[PDB]
Amino acid sequence: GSHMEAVQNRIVEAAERVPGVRGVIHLRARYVGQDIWADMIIGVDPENTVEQAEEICEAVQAAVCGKIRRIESLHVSAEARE
Amino acid sequence: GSHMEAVQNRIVEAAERVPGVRGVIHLRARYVGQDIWADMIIGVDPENTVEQAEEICEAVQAAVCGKIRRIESLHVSAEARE
Ligand SMILES: [Cl-]
């Protein structure tokens, strides 16, 4: 990977463009057949509510899955950053 | 393709998001090794100047090449639409 680094670059870029994301802290992506399954942690504003942070995570899931068709599973969690 | 239809979808989407593009009229993409070479026609406003249309074409080239790393050659021309 090769194939995978270009997919990981697209995942990070997609995520970082979602309102309220303060960087991708962690991303692990793996092939399951031809499909990608991935697990991500994003940074968020410490003073966002838990509800808002969950909304940002959901918006990242939608953006990333929408942009990268091969992704068939994506978990997104959040940590306070900056 | 398989591989290629997903690349063509990304090309069209990238192009259509550039200011002043009125649809992708034509796209031919081919693999040269692992690289993509492509030829595209976009629609533009008939009342744009030739200079403006050339600027839109150049902006499409930049956007598409920037978004799809495997593309190593992209020609973009314009036709009046709508
Ligand atoms: Cl591919």
- Nearest chain B alpha carbon to A10: B67
The experimental method is X-ray
A26 burial via Cβ count (<10 Å: 0-12, 13-18, 19+): exposed
Resolution (A): 1.5
Residues 6+ apart with CB under 8 A from A48: A20, A56
- Quote the domain boundaries for residue A33: 3-80
d(CA B59, CA B37): 17
d(CA A19, CA A30): 26
Distance A6 CA to ligand 1 centre (A): 9
Residue B22 sits in a domain whose CATH number is: 3.30.70.1350
For testing contact with chain B, the best of A7, A35, A69 (most B CBs within 10 A): A69
The closest CB to that of A69, out of B6, B69, B70, belongs to B6
d(CA A56, CA A1): 29
Q: Are A41 and A7 in contact (CB under 8 A)?
A: no
Buried b (16+ CB within 10 A) or exposed e, A32-67: eeeebebebbbbbbeebeeeebebbbebbbebbbeb
Chain A residues near residue B70 by CB distance under 8 angstroms: 6
d(CA B54, CA B42): 11
The closest CB to that of B69, out of A6, A69, A70, belongs to A6
Number of domains in chain A: 1
